[PDB]
Design a protein around this ligand. Structure first.
Ligand SMILES: [K+]
Ligand SMILES: [K+]
Ligand SMILES: [K+]
Ligand SMILES: [K+]
Lengths: 93, 93, 93, 93
């Protein structure tokens, strides 16, 4: 549960970093920057927003490599250590 | 096999939730909303439909984090506990 | 190595099925249909081609759920049982 | 740590190959070709750049199958053998 908290905070900080970057460099609204960061790191990739600048493209490359591991790490812990036990508890009437 | 049934039902409910949300908030046809929900949670992300409203964007963020774990959990069980044995059984003439 | 061969053939058959479906229902050139099938099941999802018909959308939903498991199963075996040993062998001068 | 170095170099070479291919065949700027290669192999798939030629489509199919395993292998090692210990070390004041 300390592992979950840590992954939770790391995920938030990572996404705040993306939000700051894309709003600054690609000129997105903060909400759009946050959304883009999430859709990128979860690898959903809508692409409706996609970096138009080389700085944006280079950062996105680095961001994916460093960020995917921590985002999926958090999702995996969320699924196995949080959602799994919760659904199980519901199954005992 | 009770695990498969549970993951099956959770996946259906999750997708129904997405269908309801996107048809309501983003104004998609139910079929398009369902399709969008699936393409989002499996992380395929065509993006032909992509949320235009901030409510849509914020929900999609939360939906991905909560939904990916249960959708891939179902796919993984479907693959290992259902498809794997089926193909194996076919390989004995 | 029989496991690799089986996953290889299952992957080919799965992709041929997608090729047939999308060329028929969505009217894509066979090459475009094959490409779409691959980009869908590997979850890359360019979306340049994305189903315009409801039949196309419903099939794509089912196709993803049934196909992702077998495609990633093949990729995983290709990586661990084929590429891994190959690169290792190269590392001994 | 020799495993990390090897996966690091293999990832670089794989991406250089993609950069060369897409700039040549699809006529992309090298930076755009590199970006496309990364967004493809990590399966993010923005699709803003998507192959217009059949040669491009066929290569992309083969590239995904051969490349995904080595890119995610590198990401996984980066996450578990590099990022994991680093964050842990930060947690001891
Ligand atoms: K993906
Ligand atoms: K994707
Ligand atoms: K995508
Ligand atoms: K896309």
């Amino acid at each position: 549960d300390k592992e979950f908290q840590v992954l939770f905070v790391l995920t938030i900080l990572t996404l705040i970093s993306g939000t700051i970057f894309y709003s600054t460099v690609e000129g997105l609204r903060p909400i759009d920057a946050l959304y883009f960061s999430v859709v990128t790191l979860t690898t959903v990739g809508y692409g409706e927003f996609s970096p138009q600048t080389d700085f944006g493209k280079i950062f996105t490359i680095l961001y994916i490599f460093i960020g995917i591991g921590l985002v999926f790490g958090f999702i995996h812990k969320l699924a196995v250590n949080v959602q799994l036990p919760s659904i199980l508890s519901n199954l005992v009437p």
